[PDB]
Design a protein around this ligand. Structure first.
Ligand SMILES: O=C(O)CNC(=O)C(=O)O
Ligand SMILES: [Fe+2]
Ligand SMILES: [Zn+2]
Ligand SMILES: [Zn+2]
Lengths: 6, 486
């Protein structure tokens, strides 16, 4: 799964 | 900013914030969602090769989950770990383990003591010195005699979710991944009902219900446990004049400070496996199987076994079962429906769940095991120096609890003792020795705190502690002068 964090 | 980068939603660029700060992309419409707005619960965050957002599911189908490529690995989905070794306890490991599982030795009578009921337990527990000398594990076949309040049989998970709430979030172990995630009680139930289809196994150990007005009355600790519990001693569940007198003296303690670990509910799928460990704070445990069955693999809290365990835990290795390197220290003890297991401080243990199970148990600290508790504390700190862990896996406010116990309980008693006669060895030998032991450990805490300041957050000013330690030393030295006189 393509995720991210900011 | 930029529209594309807007959940979701939530229809916002920044969540009100645990979401952390994390998003997930839809492999159809391509729009981003804050994790807390994707419709996923924490336990799903790593399951899907292709994620399809709610907006797209009825016309794109469900989300596609990774093919199980390495069932002998925690990353059972990563094709890169195919050639790597078998990890305890991956699906592959547990399966195999079950087949030879019963070859591990039974305990010596010195290790575990089996009794038919609580009445027999009481008699045997007393023969061994009671709680102040409690060192061996007990298995009680029939709760009659224990004064342990428990739900009537027929009670099950269905009743648990009704009382607790379908949306209630419980921390759950993803057995095969050997990690823990959040899951709605409702979501656990659905998976638990589907006995014939279980790609992954789940088993929650951390369901503390002492704050649920209905639950906290259905499942309580045995009376003897309540009597020696330190947490209970400090946050009594009293009322009226009692609670008022408890307030008049600064013996009141915030509910959000109390360690909530004495009333757990555990539910686990057949084939579940929790690996070796020592309950946090070196706490003791009661453990009642309401339904199902549990197999514990235990090792005495000896120095040799702690050395082995400490190495095992700090070792990066992942393929070697602790039992195999413990020199025949690990013993096998089965617990069946209705039976209860009582474990004192220090015991290293793993546990297999051969059958869908529902258990009620709890952790507590008590003066009788003060040394062993502190020894285990040291063990935890030693381990922490290497690996980095979360704090929610160790005893909550462990140090504070002792500051409060010393000031509110032990100190007041040494004082009252001192004010009369009064040799504590005569009618309080157990209190006195616990005081010296707790003081010794606290002295170190103080010193350490002066050699590098307090910690982060709160709670007890270094000033207050020092004041308390000055008071304890005074009364203790007074008492010793009384004893030397006699
Ligand atoms: O039942 C689970 O798998 C594990 N439970 C324990 O180790 C207990 O709280 O001491
Ligand atoms: Fe445990
Ligand atoms: Zn979509
Ligand atoms: Zn959002």
């Amino acid at each position: 799964a393509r995720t991210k964090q900011t | 900013p930029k529209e594309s980068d807007r959940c979701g939603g939530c229809g916002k660029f920044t969540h009100e914030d645990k979401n952390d700060f994390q998003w997930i992309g839809c492999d159809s419409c391509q729009t981003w969602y804050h994790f807390l707005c994707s419709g996923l619960e924490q336990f799903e965050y790593y399951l899907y090769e292709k994620f399809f957002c709610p907006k797209c599911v009825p016309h794109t189908g469900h989300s596609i989950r990774y093919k199980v490529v390495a069932p002998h690995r925690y990353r059972w989905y990563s094709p890169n770990e195919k050639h790597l070794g078998i990890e305890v306890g991956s699906k592959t490991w547990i399966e195999d383990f079950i087949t030879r599982e019963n070859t591990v030795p039974s305990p010596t009578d010195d290790e575990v003591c089996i009794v038919e009921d609580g009445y027999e337990f009481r008699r045997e527990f007393e023969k061994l010195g009671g709680a102040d000398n409690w060192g061996k594990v007990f298995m009680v076949k029939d709760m009659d005699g224990l004064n342990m309040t428990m739900p009537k049989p027929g009670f099950d998970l269905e009743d648990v979710v009704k009382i607790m709430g379908s949306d209630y979030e419980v921390d759950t172990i993803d057995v095969y991944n050997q990690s823990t995630y959040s899951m709605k009680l409702d979501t656990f139930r659905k998976l638990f009902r589907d006995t014939k289809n279980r790609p992954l196994l789940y088993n929650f150990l951390s369901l503390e219900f002492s704050d649920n007005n209905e639950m906290k009355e259905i499942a309580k600790p045995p009376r003897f446990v309540q009597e020696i519990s330190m947490v209970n001693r400090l946050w009594p569940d009293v009322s009226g004049a009692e609670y008022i007198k408890l307030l008049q003296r600064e013996e009141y303690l915030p509910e959000d400070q109390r360690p909530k670990v004495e009333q757990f509910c555990l539910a686990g799928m057949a084939g579940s496996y929790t690996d070796f460990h020592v309950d946090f704070g070196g706490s003791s445990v009661y453990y009642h199987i309401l339904k199902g069955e549990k197999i514990f693999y235990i090792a005495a809290p000896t120095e040799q076994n702690f050395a082995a365990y400490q190495a095992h835990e700090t070792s990066p290795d992942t393929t070697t079962w602790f039992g195999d390197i413990a020199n025949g220290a690990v013993k096998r003890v089965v617990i069946k429906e209705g039976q209860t297991l009582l474990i004192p401080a220090g015991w290293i243990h793993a546990v297999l769940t051969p059958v869908d199970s529902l258990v009620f148990g709890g952790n507590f600290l008590h003066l009788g095991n003060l040394e062993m508790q502190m020894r285990v504390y040291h063990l935890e700190n030693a381990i922490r120096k290497e690996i980095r862990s979360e704090e929610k896996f160790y005893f909550p406010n462990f140090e504070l609890l002792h500051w409060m116990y010393m000031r509110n309980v032990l100190l007041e008693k040494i004082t009252e003792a001192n004010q009369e006669g009064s040799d504590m060895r005569e009618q309080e030998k157990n209190i006195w020795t616990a005081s010296q032991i707790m003081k010794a450990e606290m002295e170190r805490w103080m010193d350490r705190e002066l050699r590098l300041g307090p910690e982060k957050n709160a709670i007890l000013p270094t000033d207050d502690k020092n004041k308390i330690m000055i008071s304890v030393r005074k009364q203790i030295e007074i008492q010793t002068k009384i004893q030397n006189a006699k």
